[PDB]
Every structure is written in C-alpha cells, then in structure tokens.
Design a protein around this ligand. Sequence first.
Ligand SMILES: *[C@@H]1O[C@H](CO)[C@@H](O[C@@H]2O[C@H](CO)[C@@H](O[C@H]3O[C@H](CO)[C@@H](O)[C@H](O)[C@H]3NC(C)=O)[C@H](O)[C@H]2NC(C)=O)[C@H](O)[C@H]1NC(C)=O
Length: 361
Amino acid sequence: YKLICYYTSWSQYREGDGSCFPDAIDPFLCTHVIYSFANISNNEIDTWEWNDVTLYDTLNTLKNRNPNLKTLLSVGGWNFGSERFSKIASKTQSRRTFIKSVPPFLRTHGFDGLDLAWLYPGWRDKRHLTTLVKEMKAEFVREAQAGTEQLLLSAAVPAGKIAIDRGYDIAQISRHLDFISLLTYDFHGGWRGTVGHHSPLFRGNSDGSSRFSNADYAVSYMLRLGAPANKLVMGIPTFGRSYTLASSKTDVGAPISGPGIPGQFTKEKGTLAYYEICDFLHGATTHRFRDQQVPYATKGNQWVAYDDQESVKNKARYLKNRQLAGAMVWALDLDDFRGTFCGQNLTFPLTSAIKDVLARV
Ligand SMILES: *[C@@H]1O[C@H](CO)[C@@H](O[C@@H]2O[C@H](CO)[C@@H](O[C@H]3O[C@H](CO)[C@@H](O)[C@H](O)[C@H]3NC(C)=O)[C@H](O)[C@H]2NC(C)=O)[C@H](O)[C@H]1NC(C)=O
C-alpha cells in the first residue's frame, strides 16, 4: 500500500511549537512525501519560498535514513491562479517550455517526481489538461533513457462530482499518471449558512440532495470513469473545519454566520490543525455522525467538523476493502507532529493510525 503525505512550505512560519520543518518528518512513516507548491515563473517550474532550496535539501536528506522513501514536488496549489495554469497549458509554446524545465529542476534538487496540483480546470481546460499530462509523461519517459530512474507523475484531483465532469478526462489521464490523489475532504465549508461535515465517508440516509458529497460516492465514480483502483489514492484530512454558530442550535442543519475563529497556531479562519483540535476538545461536547462515520465537537458558539483516530482508521479500512492503491494525507504539519498536544506522547497520531491499518491490510 502507498501512504502519500503532503508537507506545506508555509508551515515553517507558524510560531512556537506550531513551526514545522521537513526535519520533523519520520522517514519511515510515509512511502511518499510531497513538498507543497513550487511556482511557475518565465514559464518554468521554480521555487516559491525564499529558503525553499534549503528546505528541499532538508527534506531529501530523509532519504539517507530511508533509501526507499520517495519525494515529489507539487506545482500549483490554491494561491496559484488557475487562470495562470490555463494560459500555460493552452499554448504549445508555453506548455513545452514548462515541461522541458521540470526534469532538470527535479534532478537538481533531488526529487523523484512531480505532482500536478492544478486546482480546478474549467470546462474549456479539460482538453489542455489531458495534453499537459500526456506530454509531461512522454518527457519523463524520454529523460529516463539517460540511465536514471524514471520520474514519477501524479496529480491531485477534487472529489466533487461537478468538478470532475467539468475539467477532468479521467479515463485518459489515468493511463499516464503513476497515481491520483482524491481530495475527499472538501464536501462542505462556509459557502453555506449551515453546519456540516467536509469529509463524510458515507452518504448518510438523512439528507438526499447531495448523495454525491461523500468519499464512497467519489471513489465509486472514479472507478466507473476508468481510473484503475491500483492508481487511486484516497485523501484523508488531518485538519478540521470550524464554524461560528448563528444560534444555540448544534444538531444537523444548524444555522451559521461564518467560519470559526482562528486557531492559536494556524491563524486561519475556518480551519484548525489536529493538534489545535485536541486542545479545543477540553470542555467541548463531542458527537459523531453514525451514518457518515465522522465526528464533530462544539463549545460556546464554535462548531468543529474533524477526523480522529477512529474515523481515520475507518476510512483506511474502507480503501483497503475497495483495493485502492493507498491513502493520501493532507499536511503532516497539521497532524500532532510533535506528539505533545493530544495526550499520548505519540507523534503523528492520525497518520500513524492510518499506517497501522494499511500495515495489517
Ligand atoms: C511566481 O511567479 C510569478 C511569475 O513570475 C511571480 O509573479 C510575477 O512577479 C512579477 C515581479 O514580482 C510581477 O511583475 C511586477 O513588476 C512589473 C515590472 O516591474 C510590473 O509591471 C508588474 O505590475 C508587477 N506585478 C505586480 C503583481 O505588481 C508580475 O506581475 C507577477 N505576475 C504574476 C502572474 O503573478 C510571483 O511573484 C511568483 N511567486 C512567488 C511567491 O514568488
């Protein structure tokens, strides 16, 4: 089984224990670690953070301890204008220059592959995404003639039904990618004046309008569209989403006035790292959706939807039963990487729980 784990560049700037450097990553925890977000300048892949070149080095040294560990660099991301990706891929001239620049860059900094994080191509881009993947892979195949291990090519893909149909020719890109990570954790969040869970595993017989907004449906849909199970990786979040209650109602369908208050360390409205949630739980009321099989907690006027060891192991058992390639974890830096916030002095409690299930099966 594969255990793909993302590490984010900006997590280094979090104050106190919140600060996370590649240095803190256990070399034997994940099978693949992806450094989150390279930029594109002059139509060539390039660094993002001022000290990325150093961090790349720190991350890749982990391979000295675990020679089997693979690392990839992800291009794109949320702060990267999709319109920018669109303009690059749409023009053969720009596209070819970008593709040409990747292998040398990856080789120079010690990466074993590239992860495409074009966050949301429109319907006009679907065709160009396919071309980008095909041509990028053809270049990786050609570069391997030089005697080195062929570069890996992966892509992060949203799990939303509409998003998939609109910009992804799954049947086509699946044959060129080494693995596809399904972002099965963005099924809810703010845009609606109601409370809800962003990463439910199952539909939950309750509501009906959105029988497509759960992990099980997304996985089944990808399998139907042509993505081979041995190339599909299910995304499991290590963070939680927070909301500010508009009333004293906390049950399903409770009104919302907006995202929750920022966390002490992550300082981003609407999200909390798992280590922040562990602190939040003290004095909070915990609940769990039996149908969706995911928990949520409330305190004062704050409502949090998250994943714990149990929900995470459950999702791991699920992808195993569906014979998928493995699991993907968004943000090792959002898990209790120090292991000093969530009681048990266990570092990476969420990621380790996933590894445990995958290790059994
Ligand atoms: C990722 O790469 C992009 C593209 O190289 C980079 O953004 C670009 O940065 C340029 C220089 O900072 C911007 O040009 C600036 O300078 C020119 C001439 O001096 C001005 O005419 C522009 O108005 C000015 N730009 C701005 C926004 O003020 C260029 O416009 C900008 N383009 C884009 C699409 O962003 C970006 O900084 C880099 N990301 C990081 C984190 O370094």
